[PDB]
Design a protein around this nucleic acid. Structure first.
Ligand SMILES: [Mg+2]
Length: 491
DNA sequence: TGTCCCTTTGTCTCTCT
DNA sequence: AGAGAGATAAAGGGACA
């Protein structure tokens, strides 16, 4: 017979007993745990399902799932029940912070290292506990913490990095490798190539890590001589999303794209410069002539779809759904291009196809409103929240559908809608803001933390804002959100 | 196999002018 | 607002006992 047959059975046997109390996990949850944490993780959840739910820890099932769904999830669960009260009472961490640290592969290692190193990192090195939590909250957190402890002096002193930059480099997966590589390659990339320490930090952080830095070192000349790129444009490729893979693939595909399709290097860099750039470039070389045939899409439209994180997925989804959305939903190609030209375009596209008729018929929105909501990053999230929350926001809070669509139509619209739902009563009833003022604050990117900042100030007034009226705070929040408020706090 | 650590890619949210 | 930066997740490889 088959090996895993015994294992899979034990899996299902215990998995079915977890749909009961006190956890009640759905199929999705149960699979996710099975997939990343394994059988033993599923058993551990079961075996420790009462100790984690109730007194003292009182963790949500969602939080138990978060901790369980990684390699060694069994170990993280055991370690959490042991160290969560230690870390909260002895180091002043929130339980949310502890879960954050535990919710990665090798979670046990990270928790124990935090317990062992947070004192010395704050006292001897002057890091905040927040910074320590951030370093610890990725796979290999233990390694990143040990490496920060060890190289913070030499990085700040012999290499001129601020502690902030060091923390920023460290707070990624492979943090250890990024730090060690930055130590070695900073002088090389600085003195030999005219990059600033800042630019090096950017290559090292955000995923690029060691591979991006070594690939910038290796390939920067081959790119700025023959291919005639600026260092600026090389840094941009390696920086965000990037990195190594995008850089290697820009060498391969820069001519093929220009020569045969007539894209500028400018356009190529923009496609290159996201997470999965390599994938994006490739799908473009492959798919562009297919999208622009039969008087179809324009090059510039193909370039714009491609130039966001997951561009490959948006491209393939566009190629696949362009017909059905135009034919059976009445959308113009231009609209479809707008929906797709943001991070997660694939998701927004699929969610528009799925929910446009529902939001139109059941909720009385226009197709234009649905497109506008979809045409932002996280478009799927905003669309699903509008569907869920429109009736309550309108019926229970007095908002117009127009107002709800306005809150929804920015990056993080989901967060903004959920927060207006939470805080509208206390802002208006308890502090006398008008609904329109609330809607205004919330109708920007970052509407959620703008709203929270406002509530903080009116419920636990910082003296440093008291010279401003509600109306002035409101104007400030609309103008530049939380950052503006916090910047005022400093004055 | 279970665990730890690293890399790539995709998605979502917020910032900075 | 449009571009950059930061957060978080998902999934696979290497390594080791
Ligand atoms: Mg982008």
């Amino acid at each position: 017979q088959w090996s895993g047959a015994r294992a899979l059975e034990a899996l299902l046997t215990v998995a079915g007993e977890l749909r009961g109390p006190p956890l009640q996990l759905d199929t999705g949850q149960l699979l996710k745990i099975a997939k990343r944490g394994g059988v033993t993780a599923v058993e551990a959840v079961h075996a420790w399902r009462n100790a984690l739910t109730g007194a003292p820890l009182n963790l949500t099932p969602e939080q138990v799932v978060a901790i369980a769904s990684h390699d060694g999830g069994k170990q993280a669960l055991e370690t959490v029940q042991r160290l969560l009260p230690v870390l909260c009472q002895a180091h002043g961490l929130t339980p949310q912070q502890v879960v954050a640290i535990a919710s990665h592969d090798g979670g046990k290692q990270a928790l124990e290292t935090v317990q062992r190193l947070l004192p010395v990192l704050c006292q001897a090195h002057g890091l905040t506990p927040e910074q320590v939590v951030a370093i610890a909250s990725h796979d290999g957190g233990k390694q990143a913490l040990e490496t920060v402890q060890a190289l913070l002096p030499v990085l700040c002193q012999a290499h001129g990095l601020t502690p902030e930059q060091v923390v920023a480099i460290a707070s990624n997966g492979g943090g250890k490798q990024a730090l060690e590589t930055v130590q070695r390659l900073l002088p090389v990339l600085c003195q030999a190539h005219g990059l600033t320490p800042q630019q090096v930090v950017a290559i090292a952080s955000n995923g690029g890590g060691k591979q991006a830095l070594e690939t910038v070192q290796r390939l920067l000349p081959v790119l700025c001589q023959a291919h005639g790129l600026t260092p600026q444009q090389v840094v941009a490729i390696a920086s965000n999303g990037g990195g190594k893979q995008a850089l290697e693939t820009v060498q391969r595909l820069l001519p093929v794209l220009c020569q045969a399709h007539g894209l500028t290097p400018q356009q190529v860099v923009a496609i290159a410069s996201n997470r999965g750039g390599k994938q994006a470039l490739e799908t473009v070389q492959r798919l562009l002539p297919v999208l622009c045939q039969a008087h179809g899409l324009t090059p510039q439209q193909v370039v714009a779809i491609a130039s966001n994180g997951g561009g490959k997925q948006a491209l393939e989804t566009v190629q696949r759904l362009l017909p059905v959305l135009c034919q059976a939903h009445g959308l113009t190609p231009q609209q479809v291009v707008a929906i797709a030209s943001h991070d997660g375009g694939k998701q927004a596209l699929e969610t528009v196809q799925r929910l446009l008729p529902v939001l139109c018929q059941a909720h009385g929105l226009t197709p234009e409103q649905v497109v506008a909501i979809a045409s932002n990053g996280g478009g799927k999230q905003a669309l699903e929240t509008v569907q869920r929350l429109l009736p309550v926001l309108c019926q229970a809070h007095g908002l117009t559908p127009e107002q709800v669509v306005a809150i929804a139509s920015h990056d993080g619209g989901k967060q903004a809608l959920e927060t207006v739902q939470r805080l509208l009563p206390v802002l208006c009833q308890a502090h006398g803001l008008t609904p329109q003022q609330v809607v205004a604050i919330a109708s920007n990117g970052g509407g959620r933390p703008a709203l929270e900042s406002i509530v903080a100030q009116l419920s636990r007034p910082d003296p440093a804002l008291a010279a401003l009226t509600n109306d002035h705070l409101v104007a400030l929040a609309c103008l530049g959100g939380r950052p503006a408020l916090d910047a005022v706090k400093k004055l």
